[PDB]
Amino acid sequence: MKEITLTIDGKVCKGVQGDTILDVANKNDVYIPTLCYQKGLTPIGACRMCVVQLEGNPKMLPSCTTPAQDGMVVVTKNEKLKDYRRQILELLFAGRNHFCMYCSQSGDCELQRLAIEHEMDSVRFPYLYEDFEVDATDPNLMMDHNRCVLCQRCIRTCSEIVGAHTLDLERRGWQAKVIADLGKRLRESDTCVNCGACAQSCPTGTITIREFAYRGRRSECDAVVESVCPLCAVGCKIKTYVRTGSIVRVEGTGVEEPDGGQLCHMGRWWLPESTER
Amino acid sequence: NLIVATGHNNFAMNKGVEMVAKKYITGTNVPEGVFNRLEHVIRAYDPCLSCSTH
Amino acid sequence: VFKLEINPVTRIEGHGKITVMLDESGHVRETRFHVTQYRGFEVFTHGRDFREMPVITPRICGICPVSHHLASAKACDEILGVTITPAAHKLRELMHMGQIVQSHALSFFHLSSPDILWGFDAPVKIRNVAGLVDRYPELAKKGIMLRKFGQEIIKTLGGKKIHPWHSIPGGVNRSLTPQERDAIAAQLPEMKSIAMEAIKLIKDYLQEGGEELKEFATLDTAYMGLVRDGYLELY
Amino acid sequence: TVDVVEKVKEIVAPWKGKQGGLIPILQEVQRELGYLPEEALLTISRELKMPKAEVYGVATFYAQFHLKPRGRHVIRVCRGTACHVRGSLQILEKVKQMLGIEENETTDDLRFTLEPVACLGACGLAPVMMVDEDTHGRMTPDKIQAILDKYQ
Amino acid sequence: TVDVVEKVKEIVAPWKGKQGGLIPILQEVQRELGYLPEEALLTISRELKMPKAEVYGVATFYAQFHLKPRGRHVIRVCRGTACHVRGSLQILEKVKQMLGIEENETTDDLRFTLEPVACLGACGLAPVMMVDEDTHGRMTPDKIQAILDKYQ
Amino acid sequence: SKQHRIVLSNCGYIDPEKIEEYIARDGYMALGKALLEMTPEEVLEEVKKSGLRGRGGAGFPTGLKWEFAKKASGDKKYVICNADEGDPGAFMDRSTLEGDPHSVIEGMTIGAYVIGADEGYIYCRAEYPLAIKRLKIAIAQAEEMGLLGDHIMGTNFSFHLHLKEGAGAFVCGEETALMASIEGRRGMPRPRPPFPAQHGLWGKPTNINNVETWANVPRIILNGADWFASMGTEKSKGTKIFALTGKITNTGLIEVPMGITIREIIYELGGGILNGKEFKAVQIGGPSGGCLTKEHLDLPIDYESLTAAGAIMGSGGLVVMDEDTCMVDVAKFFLEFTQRESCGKCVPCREGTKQMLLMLQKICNGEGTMDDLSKLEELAHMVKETSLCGLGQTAPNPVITTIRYFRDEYVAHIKDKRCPAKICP
Ligand code: SF4
Ligand code: SF4
Ligand code: SF4
Ligand code: SF4
Ligand code: SF4
Ligand code: FES
Ligand code: FES
Ligand code: FES
Ligand code: FES
Ligand code: 3NI
């Protein structure tokens, strides 16, 4: 039977057979904390925050990658899962240098939303204060690597959605950094089409559009109007955020369409800049 | 480079503490009202020492 | 040979330390006034985008987070090379005036009003904002109202009271709708009354201690300020 | 500079149009050139039509690739379980403070290089401190000088 | 950096207050350090209270002083009258085009250095091409490879 | 001494560069037996009922693994030999590719016949500059005997046995990272599903099995089921090679039959301890495995009797540690090796292992507290329960186990300021 019936947090859920637990979760209503699942990009299993427990089975499995099997009891919120998710968030805060006081994305950060949700009034783990580089050579994008949870949603959105495969991982283990071509700066990169889809995929304020920093926040928007870019024929679908009579951020809907929300430079950088002429 | 408010008044505050000390000396017993006057010269400018030392 | 320390100097902002080095006879050889805190806002910022500076720089102080906000904003506006718009000028000036009002209200009523009222020899338990609320229930409330007026302007313009974000590099993020304009204007006959009563009180304090308070750390130095054509401009 | 553009463009010829083969395509430029310069990876990415970011990621992901010129004599100390329980860490830190160079980098003029390896096989004669030619079975704290001056 | 400040400040001690002695005071820092760094000349000028310009002028006026690090094996070819009439210029130019380095400078990684000298004495066995250890009596155009690979 | 060696029974005896001696040791007669008389399902049910508990560190009935590997929809299956060692002190796969370079070849030909695979790989580390040439010589000298080619033994079967030199990474020790390094890409464990036996190498089926588990396949059909059964206990079945090393008397491969009392594994087989001082611990699974100490003596070492003790019998890197070696020190060492050999995808193995390394370096120096120990225990349990592949799911075993067997010792490093091995206070 394609239509399978499960039980997430008591609430009964309905899904297609091949769907993962996160798909049948986001399909009905229920919320599972995720940081590395971008609707679209193939489920990458890096943050390990979406871990859910099956009844009887004492171990925990990611809801983004484990499939839904014909009837089963999934528990998403309890004490042990909350403890492990708080520990994961605290590891992320202790490893990288996260200062929310001055982050462009303090209100949109998905690591910040999760931290506040799990009442993270501490770090617990020793703060490793290592020096990760702040790549702001590009006049349009800035990559402040000490906020990088390492979710690869920027490598995947530049590998499978944009294609100009500019970003990949540098080293192994702890030294793993997101780099442009041959470990160079984003400005020095020949293969960046300056799209910004890396800024629409980054949940954690590492990659930010510079020109519209602190204004293109989704929490401080006055309105959210869906429309179509009028600059080219592709007519990308856009989700323009309006803050006091100006567009502050243009993120592209259509993560299910073949394009994948990768609006171009002219759409993520000329549309909000034209509301201020 | 930030040149902040209390910085320009640092010399005025130093010289003011000098002048209000040099008029309310006692060889011993070092009272508390003269301490309050030595603090009030600073509180006249009411300095944000956090700005001064960025 | 030996020295006195007033560490920590209280009812001021920050960390201070007055040392008074005396002689063998018990007379003041010399005094100095240290600030014993340093954070490094000239070495933090190397690498950061300049647009990050109007949000980093308000964290140098909470009594004047908009002063650093606006100075950083003018610095980044000269980095961009913008005009800037007259409406932005007047809104920035409104936020700066609100900050002037709130900082001077805190400076008079919270930090320096105990010495001005109860005298420099008053007991230490009464010399604070708390004993001021107790003994003078109306003056402390008036100072609180003036500080609240300033910070309501700052909050209306920039979201938060302390460390607001209202001035982008290039202009101003948010204007004033007529309702809150009228709300701010409807309290000005009362806040001006508060300010004038404080002016009269401090003028009676300075007129009472006639010549002593006229030589209380009064040294002749130079006076730097900002000026328009011939006027007093604060922005 | 022109010596590093055709040698890398010729070792890629028997891999054109074949799926896979970047791990071997590099193990060959490593054995030939001693290291993987940026020009090497650039030409590999050009010839295989593989992204430069992917090539650099694979080149820096695995330990036995060196993106900088490695020394003319490697000083592989064994930080395996058998040597470490025997106390090879002491030998490692003294060759560290003796060459004065960081943990996994080359000397300032390309004479030596310290490369902590896994078991070199002599888990009987522990600790082993291979000096790029032959095993060295005992290597107490004092026997490190009599070899580091000899091979230089 | 601190290794080059007291070794030069100690070899100058037996010359303080004595007229002359900058030619020897340098021939000693040359024999010890292999070359005369700018720090060396700076400390010589400080200690002897001789002008830095004079120290640099004497250091660059004479041939056997090298202000840059010389190689670990000198390749002194003889451009004397006896070798030149025999044709040593051919040997010199081929070691030139073979190491690819300029006339009187070191290799890029400090392995060799070409230093055209005067008569090394073997004006009978001409031309002589000393490779920092021993004489070499015949040195026809083909015998230059079999030694330059050996000493490296 | 006495060990009943059957896997590396020949090893050094047979000259590795000479195939004729190996076939003179009845070697490839299995291949013949399989390709001529034994129909594929028969060797399938043979190896299945043979109970060959997978020696790939995890433990598994590899007959069932091949049973999974066959039924995959496709026609381009593979068979891989993860000839790399997890423990960087283990030289078992090294010694087996040095001694008997043909057992693995014969076993993988058998298995590729069983599951219906044509292409196969052997991933051995490039940092073994002598095993590579022995294997390449073995591949050549088996190529010329019609053993890896078109219609091996005239049977309508194809098999090309490649040889991939490992780029030196323990991260590429699990299935999906091995399959990533073979496609020429960063070794990054993708989450299953897509499963390796269904959508593995190049999207085609894959049959990764251990080099020792492959080397046991020649002796499954030459002798029969009960032969492999008649070695020990009933739950786990077969025989394991062990890189017995450390500080006892004499290291080397000690292949003991089945669950045999740890006493007559270390006390008298190796023979005492160096300088005769009684041991205080033994690592029985390497870095992915736990520790056994002074209580697990009369215990069968079989796969079931020690997974509950907390130490998966992974690739036999047993190292003995007497009182002159600290347990916090070896815990930091193993966790440092793990931190150095990890991809960096999962937040638990990238940051957890870093912070656990920090907390262990702080407990060793004595700068630690009791909340430090509680945080170390909780982070260890979290990284075990949340990590992705299984390197990290078994990375804090040299902490967890050393907590459940040296707790007081841990306390003795923090509450009191003392350490058995006086290296640093
Ligand atoms: S990225 Fe998010 S969590 Fe990190 S500092 Fe910025 S707002 Fe805070
Ligand atoms: S701007 Fe576009 S092409 Fe460039 S890195 Fe970002 S997503 Fe990739
Ligand atoms: S830059 Fe952002 S999107 Fe990319 S890996 Fe880091 S946190 Fe994820
Ligand atoms: S976002 Fe760019 S590509 Fe898309 S319609 Fe607009 S201009 Fe065209
Ligand atoms: S646990 Fe995570 S980081 Fe560690 S090897 Fe597996 S995938 Fe990589
Ligand atoms: S959210 Fe499921 S693992 Fe990233
Ligand atoms: S233990 Fe160092 S050689 Fe294997
Ligand atoms: S002529 Fe060359 S040696 Fe004298
Ligand atoms: S572990 Fe640091 S000395 Fe015992
Ligand atoms: Ni201030």
Instruction: Find out whether F281 and F301 touch, Cβ atoms under 8 Å.
Output: no
Which strand (E) or helix (H) includes residue C192?
helix C188-208
In this structure, are D51 and D78 located in the same domain? no
In this structure, are E98 and E49 located in the same domain? no
CA of A196 to the centre of ligand 4 (A): 12
Instruction: Find out whether A142 and A136 touch, Cβ atoms under 8 Å.
Output: yes
Instruction: Find out whether F390 and F86 touch, Cβ atoms under 8 Å.
Output: no
In this structure, are E88 and E43 located in the same domain? no
Contacts of C68 in chain B (CB under 8 A): 2, 51
Residue whose entry in the numeric block shows the structure tokens 């204060």: A129
Residue E68 placed within a domain: no
Instruction: Find out whether F153 and F146 touch, Cβ atoms under 8 Å.
Output: yes
Residue D102 placed within a domain: yes
Distance CA F391, CA C184 (A): 63
In this structure, are D49 and D116 located in the same domain? no
Distance CA D75, CA F403 (A): 36
Please name the residue whose Cα sits nearest to atom 2 of ligand 5.
F346
Residue E135 placed within a domain: yes
Could you tell me which of F92, F380, F421 has the C-alpha nearest to residue F281? F421
Contacts of E109 in chain D (CB under 8 A): 109-110
Residue E66 placed within a domain: no
In this structure, are E81 and E43 located in the same domain? no
Instruction: Find out whether F126 and D27 touch, Cβ atoms under 8 Å.
Output: yes
Domain that holds residue E115: 73-149
Residue A51, SS3 per DSSP: strand
CA of C173 to the centre of ligand 9 (A): 58
Q: Between residues 14 and 73 of chain C, which touch chain B (CB distance below 8 Å)?
A: 14-16, 18, 20, 22, 25-28, 30-33, 35, 37-42, 57, 60-64, 68, 71
CATH of the domain at E48: 1.10.10.1590
Rounded-to-10 torsion of CA C57, C62, C63, C66: 40
**What phi-psi label fits residue F346: left (phi over 0), alpha (psi between -120 and 50 degrees) or beta?**
beta
Query: Could you say which of E14, E35, E61 is where a domain stops?
Result: E61
Domains identified in chain E, total number: 2
Does an interface of 3+ CB pairs under 8 Å exist between D and F? yes
Which strand (E) or helix (H) includes residue F236?
none
CATH of the domain at D77: 3.40.30.10
For residue F81, give every residue at least 6 positions away whose Cβ sits within 8 Å of its Cβ, in sequence order, or none. Answer: F104, F108, F120, F121, F122, F123, F124, F209, F210, F211, F214
Q: Which of A38, A158, A178 has most ligand 2 atoms within 8 Å of CB, for mutation?
A: A158
Q: How far is CA F60 from CA E70, F5, F53, F213, F307, in A?
A: 64, 22, 5, 10, 13
Give the closest of A101, A214, A220 to C168, CB-based. A214
Distance CA E75, CA D63 (A): 38
Distance CA A115, CA D46 (A): 43
Distance CA C178, CA C156 (A): 12
Instruction: Find out whether F6 and F229 touch, Cβ atoms under 8 Å.
Output: no
Our CA angle for F383, F388, F394, nearest 5°, is 50
Instruction: Find out whether C125 and C114 touch, Cβ atoms under 8 Å.
Output: no
In this structure, are E77 and E143 located in the same domain? yes
CA of F352 to the centre of ligand 5 (A): 11
Q: How far is CA F394 from CA A231, B47, F88, in A?
A: 53, 58, 16
- CB of A194 within 6 A of ligand 2: the answer is yes
Residue whose entry in the numeric block shows the structure tokens 């010289």: B15
Give the closest of B4, B6, B17 to C18, CB-based. B17
Our CA angle for C137, C138, C143, nearest 5°, is 110
Range list of H helices, E70-112: 81-86, 88-99
Q: Is the peptide bond before E69 cis (omega within 30 degrees of 0)?
A: no
Q: How many CB atoms lie within 10 A of CB D94?
A: 15
In this structure, are E94 and E139 located in the same domain? yes
For residue F271, give every residue at least 6 positions away whose Cβ sits within 8 Å of its Cβ, in sequence order, or none. Answer: F248, F249, F250
The residue type of C170 is G
Contact A128/F355, CB-based, under 8 Å?
yes
Residue E67 placed within a domain: no
In this structure, are E32 and E85 located in the same domain? no
Question: Residue E53 has which token pair?
Answer: 């310009």
Concatenate the DSSP letters of all residues of A225-252 into one string: EEEE--SSTT--EEEEEESSSSEEE---
Residue D67 placed within a domain: no
- Antiparallel, parallel or unpaired: β C16-22 and C2-5: antiparallel
Residue C179 class from Cβ within 10 Å (0-12 exposed, 13-18 middle, 19+ buried)?
exposed
- Annotated ligand binding at F242? The verdict is no
Does an interface of 3+ CB pairs under 8 Å exist between B and D? no
In this structure, are D57 and D78 located in the same domain? no
In this structure, are D11 and D45 located in the same domain? yes
In this structure, are D143 and D84 located in the same domain? yes
- CB of A200 within 6 A of ligand 2: the answer is no
Residue F218 class from Cβ within 10 Å (0-12 exposed, 13-18 middle, 19+ buried)?
buried
Instruction: Find out whether F338 and F353 touch, Cβ atoms under 8 Å.
Output: yes
Distance CA C114, CA D27 (A): 79
Could you tell me which of A167, A194, A180 has the C-alpha nearest to residue A267? A194
Contacts of A101 in chain C (CB under 8 A): 55-56, 59, 163
In this structure, are E78 and E35 located in the same domain? no
C-alpha E118: how far from its chain's center? 12
Chain C partners (3+ C-beta pairs within 8 A): A, B
- Annotated ligand binding at E100? The verdict is no
Residue D66 placed within a domain: no
Contact A214/C55, CB-based, under 8 Å?
yes
Phi, psi (degrees; rounded to nearest 5) at F31 = -55, -50
Distance CA F271, CA F291 (A): 20
Our CA angle for D146, D148, D151, nearest 5°, is 105
Distance CA E37, CA E67 (A): 6
The residue type of F342 is S
Q: Is the peptide bond before C169 cis (omega within 30 degrees of 0)?
A: no
Q: Which of A92, A103, A113, A218 has most ligand 1 atoms within 8 Å of CB, for mutation?
A: A103
Q: How far is CA D119 from CA E73, E78, F319, in A?
A: 36, 51, 13
Residue E110 placed within a domain: yes
C-alpha C13: how far from its chain's center? 10
Distance CA C136, CA F118 (A): 95
Question: Residue A218 has which token pair?
Answer: 């989704």
Longest dimension (CA), chain D: 55
For residue F104, give every residue at least 6 positions away whose Cβ sits within 8 Å of its Cβ, in sequence order, or none. Answer: F81, F83, F96, F97, F122, F211, F214, F215
Phi, psi (degrees; rounded to nearest 5) at F77 = -65, 165
